[PDB]
């Protein structure tokens, strides 16, 4: 059987079993349609249409099942023609970034807007987590780059490019002693229980440094991996949150009070990192540059070319980067 | 767009994108085929196949939507012929079943006798194979019905009807250590070399779960698709076998000891199913019922009407299926 | 054999067979580690690690049997500290929980508040992550409890306890073609580009299952680990989000519209669990009951003494769990 | 704490609080046991025993629980020592073969047996299937070696080495008409229902070639993949079996009558085969040579270097093959 035979038997039913009438619709003759039908009835071995002399009187019970299915065939044929083009698929390559929740939320939905306009068929996948995790993803090859925020010693064995410098903040509820205060000392901060990052205190961080030169041990009551959680816990108890400054601003967090700790802890440096051996696709260079405007392709090449991260440190040394 | 064109692109895929194989198989010429494909690719304005040179390397994304509808179309045309034959000679046709070696030997002979009694003019064709091979057989047209014994995820696109639950045994020769301990733990078993199915360990079977659970790795010295192969292996060496209980008889197999493993591996479930597109002739319902007494015509038509195989399981929540 | 040696070979697997990483992380010398490890292979007569030069390529098969037991040893040693801690001062200690961003933000504040009130001397620590990352957190010993939301096969080696069932919503901008259709089939959805978790599509998820059932492949333009990041992506573009209903509120998020997907994807079960080796302290039973009311002290110890997580689900058949 | 302390507290209860008996039994001093136990008591910050003067009187409530775990801890340290050596794994490489049931079980039990002993740490994997499935297994890369029995045109583009030559028998129940017929004829056979392989009649097989050149068209009532399954069914009615003669003998199949059919159908050739790019190992060359003694290492290698499949058959022209 052929598609054409199927069209014909569905059209003959559309046009009242008026075989003459059918043919006008479809630019052919009565002994043409009539021939293809009689052929199919012979192939299948059963009559689709009961017949009084020459006139067709009605569709047979077998007839009716067959026409019903033939309508489906036709429906599915048209469906084939309707299939979307290859343009509708994100199959031109994919970018896997490992970073933090703050990196993903704040720095990045102005960059990612910009990147998806430039590359509509390139899929993007943001992994989250601790520094340990962000590092493991790149080196195990389950992510192409890390945007690293701290504990940069774990991204030894990658290539690491400076993006910007960042500073932490003491966030408290509006009710809190600290909320209306000429700044805050390290000793004042060691007084209240701390809500910080899981990896906030490790033994070697900027938080451990500050508490260790002052001889204070801090009381840690709650920790979590992402700032959102920390802020959210800071609607509960005399606890004092320490998080990145760029993870709280007064527009979107008015139940909350950002206070300076730049005196108290040293700055951290966000870097974008990847494996020596990684082919840098066009969209890889575009992402790097959007996120951090000074890392153009010429700049990224100059740095991959150097012997190690020691030298890359010597490259940027006297370059002033943004604070965020 | 011609039906012969949808047969070609489908058959190409059924033959690993090898077009010379496709031709041998369909008794037509390679140029003819490649030609039809290039015309359809042109009519639709959509590359279906990625190409290297002359070679076809893969099915493109848009390409897959096309192939999927094409298979539908083709199975509908088969449905027409099938409907014509029911109305012409109800008791005359052929039944194509894919299932395992064990089902063919231990679940079905009894049923197949009684079926052939009832339907002398219905030719029965039983493909043996792995779960994957069974799924393949229906996917590729060689099989109206599948009796799945496990790895039921491989059939999410079929209607699948529960038949019975079944449990595995440990099988050794009577001179084996484990013969006269007659109370085996997962920890005891994992010492020994294992002789099981090729698809026994797949990452997600019940054997997988039981070892993962106890944190062990199996020692696999030998596998086979077929339980009879496994058993005649076990008659030589120091392997321990893990096969369906119903595959070992105290009568037929008294050189093999059969140990209990209900308290190690969870039971599997056998199901019988078919593409939703498949016209169910009266002899089909018979067969189903003779295999699984609770799968009456009503029950089967009710099941088919539902939308998931999970909803079909909801239908049998208050009924406790046989244990084999 | 020494405890210190077992910590070394296990913390070595933990840092991906990387010995100077193991060193840095445990404030100690690298050869100290190498010499302990060679000593243990010596003492056991078994190579635990494949070697090349002075490089560690993989864990040997008999080597893995040894690590798996080591991990047990150490986690039992930590129990002895915990039994001591309990008997000395019970209301004091720490609790490490690994779960998802969505459970930390939308299921736990109110359980956490209640908990910190009762146990001000118990520091609480919430790891966020993928289902993979949660299993890992308990495996490595950085977590006492897991609160898993899907992919429960990843915790077959844990006592897992059902808490509640949850569902997915399709989320879109209030001007997307889908908002005023109120009526989405999987076919309609599959047209669109998808935004969803990094672990949305894995081959065996509930998302995978709906698509395989309908023969369709999803268009995936962006994934994130974190449901919030998905949410703010969906506030920009053309793509449709697929996330837990409970990550989207009419008042939390009025800029997003939340469409029924109950009839597309099957529900998932949230569960809470922990290594069998873990000693359960008084605040731990407490944490568990505060999260899942039906999970009482008696219930938990009953669930522990069973043998699998299916048998544990068996216990809550004659009881409908909350839906979320 | 140290394993030694845990051994000590454990061992002290075994010797019923007698430190002296302890020292004798573990070959150590009383002062050193007593010191190590105080040490653990300090570390843990709790007493594990009560004291009368200097002797030891009773165990504490916490002690009771610490000892419980201690025993467990020790028992696991034992299990490390008892781990089976690197020899008990079959991890020296594995051998995957795609062939038929017949081949597996009537040619190979004796060829495997010999291959196993020589290579006890080489795992052996026996995929079954139809000719078309056997060829895929290899080309795809789920098996190294196919032992093909017929329709050798599917294994073009693989290296195929002739092994031997085989013919078919008619097979019947002792109650069948042909059971005691002086010979049997292409016409007599055709008048009967036929029971044969699924791929028995293809359009171009030795069964087609025979029935086609006599203008007979056969009735086929049942087909299966395996000969074993073909044999079983032939306890029914009027059906005639057509299978390989090597898969039936009167001693182990006395229920059936093996009646000759060399007049009716020409012989096929069994061949063993692999992909060109396959790196042949030693246990590879061995299995080949145990299966077909003419296929020595040097012959295989000559064959693989040759130009076409053409020449390969010509290499065996003057070499008479076994007949089975
Ligand atoms: C600036 C930044 O993103 N910092 C991390 C913390 O290192 C964060 O997750 O907030
Ligand atoms: C019950 C059954 O047939 N089980 C399969 C294994 O999945 C077999 O072939 O033995
Ligand atoms: C209910 C829940 O927490 N869902 C997970 C996904 O399983 C999430 O991270 O949103
Ligand atoms: C001789 C042989 O093995 N023949 C196959 C069929 O070609 C069989 O399975 O019996």
Author numbering:
A (entry chain B), B (entry chain C), C (entry chain A), D (entry chain D): 1 to 324
Article excerpt on this structure:
Under conditions of sulphur limitation and in the presence of the inducer, N-acetylserine, CysB binds to cys promoters and activates the transcription of the downstream coding sequences. CysB is a homotetramer of 36 kDa subunits, each comprising a smaller N-terminal DNA binding domain and a C-terminal effector binding domain. CysB is a member of the LysR-type transcriptional regulator (LTTR) family, named after its founding member. To elucidate the subunit arrangement in the tetramer, we determined the crystal structure of intact CysB in complex with N-acetylserine.
The H32 and H3 crystal structures have 2 and 8 molecules in the asymmetric unit respectively. In the H32 crystal form, a crystallographic twofold axis of symmetry generates the CysB tetramer while the asymmetric unit of the H3 crystal form contains two CysB tetramers. There are two protomer types in each tetramer distinguished by the juxtaposition of the DNA binding and the effector binding domains. In each tetramer, two of the chains (B and D) adopt the extended conformation as illustrated for Molecule B in Fig. 1A while the other two chains (A and C) exhibit a compact conformation as shown for Molecule A in Fig. 1B. The change in overall structure arises from alternative conformations of hinge regions flanking the linker helix. In the tetramer as shown in Fig. 1D, the four effector binding domains form a core from which the DNA binding domains project in pairwise arrangements, A-D and B-C. The interface between subunits A and B is extensive at 1540 Å2 with 45 residues on each chain participating. The interactions between chains A and D, equivalent to those between chains C and B, are dominated by the packing of the linker helices. To investigate potential larger scale structural changes, we performed a normal mode analysis of the N-acetylserine bound ABCD CysB tetramer in the H3 crystal form using the tools available at WEBnm@. In the lowest frequency mode, the origin of motion appears to be at the twofold axis running through the core of the tetramer resulting in modest movements of the EBDs of chains A and C and larger movements of the EBDs of chains B and D. These movements radiate out to the DNA binding domains with the largest movements occurring at DBDB and DBDD which are furthest from the two-fold axis.
